[PDB]
Amino acid sequence: MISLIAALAVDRVIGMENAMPWNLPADLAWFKRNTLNKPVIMGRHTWESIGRPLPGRKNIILSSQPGTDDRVTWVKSVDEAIAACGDVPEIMVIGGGRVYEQFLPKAQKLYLTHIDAEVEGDTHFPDYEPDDWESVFSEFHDADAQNSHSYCFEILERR
Ligand SMILES: NC(=O)c1ccc[n+]([C@@H]2O[C@H](COP(=O)([O-])OP(=O)(O)OC[C@H]3O[C@@H](n4cnc5c(N)ncnc54)[C@H](OP(=O)(O)O)[C@@H]3O)[C@@H](O)[C@H]2O)c1
Ligand SMILES: Nc1nc(=O)c2nc(CNc3ccc(C(=O)N[C@@H](CCC(=O)O)C(=O)O)cc3)cnc2[nH]1
Ligand SMILES: [Mn+2]
Ligand SMILES: [Mn+2]
C-alpha cells in the first residue's frame, strides 16, 4: 500500500540546496490533491525544505535523531514509518532522494510529474527499473502565466 509522489526535472533532478527552484503552482496543487487525507512520509531534509507541517495529512518524518517538533510524528526506520501510518490503504512517500530509494522497492504506484526544465541539481529521483512500471495515466500541460514550464502528470503502477 505504498506510493511515491515526486516532481522530476531534466535528468531526474528533484532538488538543489534544499529547494526545488521549480515554481509550478499547478504541480503543487496536484501534489495536494493526491496527498490530502493520507499519511505522508518524508525524510528530515525534506521536512526542513518544506519548513512547516502539511495540513490535512499525518506528517511522518524519518530521522535517526530525536524529533524536534511534536506537530508531526518522528520515526527512526522505514518499517516504523510504515507502522506509524496506521492501518490505511494508501501511504504517500514524499521524498527526498534518500527516502525515495528506500521506499521504491516496496511501493506499488508512482505519481511522477515530468517537468520540462533544466536544473543543475544535488538530488535525484531513483534510477528505477522502467520495465517494471505500467503507465495508467499521462496528462500534459503547456506552460502558462502561472507555470513557466510545461509538465506532465503521470501515474505508474507496478506490472
Ligand atoms: N522534486 C520533488 O518532488 C522533491 C520531493 C521531496 C524532496 N525534494 C528535494 O530533495 C532534497 C532532500 O532530499 P535528500 O535526499 O537530501 O534528503 P531526504 O531523503 O529528505 O532526508 C534524508 C534524511 O532522512 C533521514 N532518513 C532517511 N532514511 C532513514 C531511515 N531509514 N531511518 C532513519 N532516518 C532516515 C535521515 O535523517 P537524519 O540525518 O536526521 O538521521 C536522512 O539523512 C531537497 O532538495 C528537496 O527540496 C524534492
Ligand atoms: N508532484 C510533486 N510536486 C511537488 O511539488 C512535490 N513536493 C514534494 C515535497 N515538497 C513539498 C513542497 C511544498 C508543498 C506545498 O506547499 N504544497 C501545498 C499546496 C500547494 C502550496 O500551497 O504550495 C500542500 O498543502 O501540499 C508540498 C510538498 C514531494 N513530492 C512532490 N511531488
Ligand atoms: Mn526546461
Ligand atoms: Mn503514457
Asked if residue 134 lies in contact with residue 52, where contact means CB atoms within 8 angstroms, the answer is: no
Asked if residue 15 lies in contact with residue 122, where contact means CB atoms within 8 angstroms, the answer is: yes
Determine the distance separating the centroid of ligand 4 and the alpha carbon of 139, expressed in angstroms: 8
* Phi, psi (rounded to 5 degrees) for 60: -120, 125
Cell numbers representing residue 109 in the block: 504506484
Determine the distance separating the centroid of ligand 2 and the alpha carbon of 62, expressed in angstroms: 18
* 56: region left, alpha or beta (phi > 0 left; psi from -120 to 50 alpha): left
Enumerate the β-bridge partners of residue 138.
154
138, HSE (Cβ side, Cα atoms, 13 Å): 6
18 lines ligand 1 (CB under 6 A): yes
What is the four-CA torsion angle of 42, 48, 49, 51, rounded to 10 degrees? Answer: 110
Given resolution (angstroms): 0.9
For 113-136, the DSSP string reads: EEE------SEE-----GGGEEEE
Polymer length in residues for the chain: 159
Domain 1-159 fold: Dihydrofolate Reductase, subunit A (3.40.430)
Domain boundaries, the chain: 1-159
Classify strands 40-43 and 91-93 as parallel, antiparallel or unpaired: parallel
Burial 105-131 (b: 16+ CB within 10 A, else e): eebebbbbbbbebebebebbbbebeee
Closest CA to 34 of 158, 136, 155: 155
